[PDB]
Amino acid sequence: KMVQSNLRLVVSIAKKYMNRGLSFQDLIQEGSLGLIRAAEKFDHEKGYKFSTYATWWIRQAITRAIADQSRTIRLPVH
DNA sequence: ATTTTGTAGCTACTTATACAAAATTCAGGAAAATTTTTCTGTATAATGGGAGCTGTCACGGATGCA
Secondary structure, three states, X not given: OOHHHHOOOHHHHHHHHHHHOXXXXXXXXXXXXXXXXXXXXXXXXXXXXXXXXXXXXXXXXXXXXXXXXXXXXXOOOO
């Protein structure tokens, strides 16, 4: 009831990579993945909203997808 | 009348054997060394996209119908 509760914003992020590559939907997922992870690695004790932390993990997730594939010959993401 | 042919012959004399360890190298292993690939985090806040295309057909359907 939180990961989904967010939903939007992650699409505002993923959509930035919908044109970068992969696929709007493809992205969305990826984020989602992240979303999760964040969604729980996350600590309301530091107060400031997940908007300044959830979006972190997202981004991460994503990048690791158009770089992890979307190329049909995987190269050292590094 | 020597010479070539001999015969009755060996001895020297040299392959032949086979082994043989000694080389002598090679391969594989093993690391170990290290280089390259992976993995993970990131704290103000951030909360719906892109596009357009716009000139046959057919048919069977067309359910849908009024």
